[PDB]
């Protein structure tokens, strides 16, 4: 089966350079056009560039013309996007896609995308604080508890409960950017009130960009 796999994204300073790659499998990029398409956080899709790897001919969107270079190496079945003079406007998920070819000009296969964040802000791991279940939780009913994952940069963070054993009733909220310029989110779960004080609830927080891993026990306050 055809697959496209992007790599090379990350956090980069404004004015810097970054090279993305797109490795193709299950087909040969000589037979197709390869594209980059990007999506800024919360925005629509925007085509960036295309290449025909057999002759190397390229086309660019006006917003990246002169700053970005698309290229390909048919002997590696891989395409590249060299990004230079990066601006905050360039922050986006970058997708690789292809045209089907042979008269087919829709984008039938896409990669999962690679996130590029252009910012002068340093990495920072989150602090994790308990959202302790209320002592007024209705006896024999349903109680809520959670974790507050505060003050981290950049995105993303992942949260699980009891190392994946607890999934039903979990809501991990989309992060919000605080006025400080750091992200924050909460993860909550509803559980039977009878389970409080006996069942253990641990949120597992992973912030790969800062290599931060925190397991936080959430229990009723004494």
């Amino acid at each position: 089966e055809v697959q496209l796999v992007e790599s090379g994204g990350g956090l980069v300073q404004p004015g810097g350079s970054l090279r993305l790659s797109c490795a193709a499998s299950g087909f040969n990029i000589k037979d197709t056009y390869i594209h980059w398409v990007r999506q800024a956080p919360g925005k629509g899709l925007e085509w960036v560039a295309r290449i025909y790897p057999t002759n190397g001919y390229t086309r660019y969107a006006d917003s990246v013309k002169g700053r970005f270079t698309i290229s390909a190496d048919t002997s590696k079945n891989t395409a590249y996007l060299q990004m230079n003079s990066l601006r905050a406007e360039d922050t986006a998920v970058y997708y690789c896609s292809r045209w089907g070819g042979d008269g087919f000009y829709a984008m039938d296969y896409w990669g999962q995308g690679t996130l590029v964040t252009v910012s002068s802000a340093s990495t920072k791991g989150p602090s994790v604080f308990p959202l302790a279940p209320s002592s007024k939780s209705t006896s024999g009913g349903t109680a809520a508890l959670g974790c507050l994952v505060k003050d981290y940069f950049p995105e993303p963070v992942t949260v699980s409960w009891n190392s994946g054993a607890l999934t039903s009733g979990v809501h991990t909220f989309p992060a919000v950017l605080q006025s400080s310029g750091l992200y924050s989110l909460s993860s909550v779960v509803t559980v039977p009130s009878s389970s409080l004080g006996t069942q253990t609830y641990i949120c597992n927080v992973n912030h790969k960009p800062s290599n931060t891993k925190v397991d936080k026990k959430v229990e009723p306050k004494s």
Partner: protein
């Protein structure tokens, strides 16, 4: 540059309803138009190619049609998994251009939220900041009003909301509202309350705690 003007920006429909999304090309693009579905956190997925042809693996409820410069995506029977943003695209000329997208959500019966309030942890207070969290769990519709009261004084400019994506199982939403205060302000006041207004609630619901009790 050919423009693709997509309407509506968003829509809500019940399971089994017929949904119509339209796009007007600024000039003739023949049938060089494709439709894509994008679910949260995922890459776009091709639904329709050459204006009217169903792509691989796409359920038969999806179809596309063309009349002149008017392009229409139809979902004949909306399903809960169809919650997504839909995009048209022309590829008649370079650059290929996308429509602005249509956000589709599922309309279901009204469900009132279950409301919970959380005080700041002692560990956070040691850092000098206090976060108070109000949770609205598993409700519909998404619209809700959450107001913070500190010693019966309405708060403004110090809270942020976040909303989950629509649930795949029961088509509901959950919402958090987070109040941020300094440690000194948090220790001066006593009564912390979040007041919730929603169509599923006959009267507003208030959850509150007294600091230290």
């Amino acid at each position: 540059d050919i423009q693709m003007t997509q309407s509506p920006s968003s829509l809500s429909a019940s399971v089994g309803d017929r949904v119509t999304i339209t796009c007007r090309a600024s000039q003739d693009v023949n049938t060089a138009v494709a439709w894509y579905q994008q679910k949260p956190g995922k890459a776009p997925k091709l639904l329709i190619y050459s204006a009217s042809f169903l792509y691989s693996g796409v359920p038969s409820r999806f179809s596309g049609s063309r009349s002149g410069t008017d392009f229409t995506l139809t979902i004949s029977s909306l399903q809960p998994e169809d919650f997504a943003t839909y995009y048209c695209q022309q590829h008649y000329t370079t650059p290929p251009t996308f429509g602005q997208g249509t956000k589709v959500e599922i309309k279901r019966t009204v469900a009132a939220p279950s409301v919970f309030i959380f005080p700041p942890s002692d560990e956070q207070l040691k850092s000098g900041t206090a976060s108070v969290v109000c949770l609205l769990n598993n409700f519909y519709p998404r619209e809700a009003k959450v107001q913070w009261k500190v010693d019966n004084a309405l708060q403004s400019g110090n809270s942020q909301e976040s909303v989950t994506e629509q649930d795949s199982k029961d088509s509901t939403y959950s919402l958090s509202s987070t109040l941020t205060l300094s440690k000194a302000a948090y220790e001066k006041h006593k009564v912390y309350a979040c007041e919730v207004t929603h169509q599923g609630l006959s009267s507003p619901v208030t959850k509150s705690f007294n600091r230290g009790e």
